[PDB]
Amino acid sequence: QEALENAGRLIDRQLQEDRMYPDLSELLMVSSGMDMDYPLQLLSVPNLPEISSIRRVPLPPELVEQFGHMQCNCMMGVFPPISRAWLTIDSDIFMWNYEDGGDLAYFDGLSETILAVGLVKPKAGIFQPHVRHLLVLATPVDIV
Amino acid sequence: FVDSTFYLLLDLITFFDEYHSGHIDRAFDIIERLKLVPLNQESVEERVAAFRNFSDEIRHNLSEVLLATMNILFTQFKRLKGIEDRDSQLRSQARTLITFAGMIPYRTSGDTNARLVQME
């Protein structure tokens, strides 16, 4: 009867309903065939388009310049947590700020070609458990 | 709305405090945060579309926002001595900014003497 309790009850009920919402994937959903709203054309789905392209950022030329000479191997990628991008040419590695681009970091530590790089979480209990992330870099000879 | 412009004015002011008194790098970061000036790509034009929309108070302030950018951008990007040096960024930023300034000079006081700072 009291409005205040009443309102609370309504929200709670609705909250419950929101939580109950059906599971995303079920075999039954598209057992016959998938419903698709599929246009070949960009912005073909006018109102509905799930994604839009907000912006394009080119690799900074300053970064590119230190990638100019690469005999052996190239590779690049984005680190999801960092919101930074990395470029590997031969031995050297660059990390550049997604948002900035001017800001870039360079590894001079590695002597040899860099086979692979990866971002990983630290162990539960080591001296560096505190650090947010670890950067693993593998070259032919060593893993740093 | 009223509060929003208020915060923007404060942000711009903190940018001032740190602009000069060194802290070149910090100034760019803050200016970009303002989301007024195109740091990204040629999105400079979107910055045109969103310009006229701007409230009267900000519309007036932009002149200094530009040129502050081309300054820090200049000084920070003093050609260095003798490795990863991405000069390219903080360079593209000037470019986008200039296109921006190029598009609205008429709707600005009339000092595209960004050019003087721009070159050397």
UniProtKB/Swiss-Prot annotation, chain A:
Disease: Atrial fibrillation, familial, 15: A familial form of atrial fibrillation, a common sustained cardiac rhythm disturbance. Atrial fibrillation is characterized by disorganized atrial electrical activity and ineffective atrial contraction promoting blood stasis in the atria and reduces ventricular filling. It can result in palpitations, syncope, thromboembolic stroke, and congestive heart failure.
Job of this protein: Essential component of nuclear pore complex. Could be essessential for embryogenesis. Nucleoporins may be involved both in binding and translocating proteins during nucleocytoplasmic transport.
Assembly description: Interacts with GLE1. Able to form a heterotrimer with GLE1 and NUP42 in vitro. Forms a complex with NUP35, NUP93, NUP205 and lamin B.
Subcellular location: Nucleus, Nuclear pore complex; Nucleus membrane
Domain of life: Eukaryota
Disulfide bond positions: none
Name of the protein described by the UniProt record: Nuclear pore complex protein Nup155
Distribution of this protein across tissues and organs: Expressed in all tissues tested, including heart, brain, placenta, lung, liver, skeletal muscle, kidney and pancreas.
Family note: Belongs to the non-repetitive/WGA-negative nucleoporin family.
PTM annotation: Phosphorylated. Phosphorylation and dephosphorylation may be important for the function of NUP155 and may play a role in the reversible disassembly of the nuclear pore complex during mitosis.
From Swiss-Prot, chain B:
Membrane spanning stretches: none
Superkingdom of the organism of origin: Eukaryota
Location relative to the cell: Nucleus membrane; Nucleus, Nuclear pore complex; Nucleus envelope
Function: Plays a role in the nuclear pore complex (NPC) assembly and/or maintenance. May anchor nucleoporins, but not NUP153 and TPR, to the NPC. During renal development, regulates podocyte migration and proliferation through SMAD4 signaling.
Disorder named in the UniProt entry: Nephrotic syndrome 12: A form of nephrotic syndrome, a renal disease clinically characterized by severe proteinuria, resulting in complications such as hypoalbuminemia, hyperlipidemia and edema. Kidney biopsies show non-specific histologic changes such as focal segmental glomerulosclerosis and diffuse mesangial proliferation. Some affected individuals have an inherited steroid-resistant form and progress to end-stage renal failure. NPHS12 inheritance is autosomal recessive.
Assembly description: Part of the nuclear pore complex (NPC). Component of the p62 complex, a complex composed of NUP62 and NUP54. Forms a complex with NUP35, NUP155, NUP205 and lamin B; the interaction with NUP35 is direct. Does not interact with TPR. Interacts with SMAD4 and IPO7; translocates SMAD4 to the nucleus through the NPC upon BMP7 stimulation resulting in activation of SMAD4 signaling.
UniProt similarity note: Belongs to the nucleoporin interacting component (NIC) family.
Official protein name in the record: Nuclear pore complex protein Nup93
Classification lineage: Eukaryota, Metazoa, Chordata, Craniata, Vertebrata
Primary gene name: NUP93
